[PDB]
Write an enzyme that holds these catalytic residues in place. Structure first.
Site, PDB file in Angstrom:
ATOM      1  CG  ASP A  19      -6.841   1.988  -3.254  1.00 17.35           C
ATOM      2  OD1 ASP A  19      -5.856   2.694  -3.468  1.00 17.35           O
ATOM      3  OD2 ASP A  19      -7.995   2.273  -3.650  1.00 17.35           O
TER       4      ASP A  19
ATOM      5  CB  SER B 111       7.976  14.944  -4.835  1.00 13.91           C
ATOM      6  OG  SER B 111       9.164  14.735  -5.512  1.00 13.91           O
TER       7      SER B 111
END
Ligand code: NA
Length: 330
Positions: free
Chosen positions: A35, A199
């Site tokens: 994770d 992004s």
């Protein structure tokens, strides 16, 4: 040193991935959920409340000649999905894919929430976010990566998740055979303890690319792609009959649909998520309403590039002095 381990989807939907991890001496192999959005290595154990264990493999520290209680240390964690676990702490030898760390904090669960009990395939979590998020008190502990780092050939790990197929976690090297083209690296903020990046925009299907900054985290422990409501609405508007369902808890779409791809930007590069990756199947067994793999992040307080996004790429988690993320097509 290096390590290389195969990661395997837990079910037909790629709801999560499990990776075998050797703990203790002799080795006890547990299948952990790696994770990159958390920083605790915790396991089902001989200490876990018996009624909260249903099929998981447990770590038994008393059977490990290298286990030692980390006296006084406790841990307690809550995840974004509402799940939780807590317990005490041992140090022991932990190996992943042939890479060994001695003295790793192994957090032994005394209590786990129902979602953990109900998932017999996941024996615990191995956190790969920054050690600043580790929950051990009163002495915070390091992640497996942070303890391995100085021994690695390169201070990196990579995630290569499969779509309905196994993939690979590598530590200490880039496998230049595992991706196509070049790797585009992008800046990381560690201020919230995550692999947080920005992004450069998105496209829906064959549509034009929208240049827009989207801050979010690279999180292998989250199944879906969670993005701002504007972006998510623009995606599902291209699917006839898709709608946001307050009763189901997100966007649903007709199971008869063919989904468009979703592209996200990494600098000037582009990662394309095929439409098929965005199908999470019937909302309940036999339903003709299917659950979407792109959902709104509104109310979560962060955008999350979970497995839906990451499994479309070869992803480099660069833990050099200034961390960065890299993405390549594959
Ligand atoms: Na669900």
């Amino acid at each position: 040193s290096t390590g290389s381990a195969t990661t395997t989807p837990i079910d037909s939907l790629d709801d999560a991935y499990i990776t075998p991890v050797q703990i203790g001496t002799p080795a006890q192999t547990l299948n952990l959920d790696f994770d990159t959005g958390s920083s605790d290595l915790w396991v089902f154990s001989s200490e876990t409340t018996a009624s909260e264990v249903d099929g998981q493999t447990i770590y038994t520290p008393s059977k490990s000649t290298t286990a030692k209680l980390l006296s006084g240390a406790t841990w307690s964690i809550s995840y974004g999905d509402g799940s939780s676990s807590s317990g005490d702490v041992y140090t022991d030898t932990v190996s992943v894919g042939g890479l060994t760390v001695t003295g790793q904090a192994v957090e032994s669960a005394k209590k786990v929430s129902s979602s953990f009990t109900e998932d017999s395939t996941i024996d615990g979590l191995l956190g790969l976010a920054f050690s600043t998020l580790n929950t051990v008190s009163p002495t915070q502990q390091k992640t497996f990566f942070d303890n391995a780092k100085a021994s690695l050939d390169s201070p990196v790990f990579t995630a290569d998740l499969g779509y309905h197929a196994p993939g690979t976690y590598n530590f200490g090297f880039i496998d230049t055979t595992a991706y196509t083209g070049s790797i585009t690296y992008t800046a990381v903020s560690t201020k919230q303890g995550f692999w947080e990046w920005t992004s450069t925009g998105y496209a829906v299907g064959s549509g034009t690319f929208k240049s827009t900054s989207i801050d979010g985290i690279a999180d292998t422990g989250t199944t879906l792609l969670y993005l701002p409501a504007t972006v998510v609405s623009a995606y599902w508007a291209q699917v006839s009959g898709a709608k946001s369902s307050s009763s189901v808890g997100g966007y649903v779409f007709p199971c008869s649909a063919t989904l468009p791809s979703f592209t996200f930007g990494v600098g000037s590069a582009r990662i394309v998520i095929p439409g098929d990756y965005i199908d999470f199947g019937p909302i309940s067994t036999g339903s003709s309403s299917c659950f979407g793999g792109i959902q709104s992040s509104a109310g979560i307080g962060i955008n999350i590039f979970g497995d839906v996004a990451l499994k479309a790429a070869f992803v480099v988690f660069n833990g050099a002095t200034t961390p960065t993320l890299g993405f390549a097509s594959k």
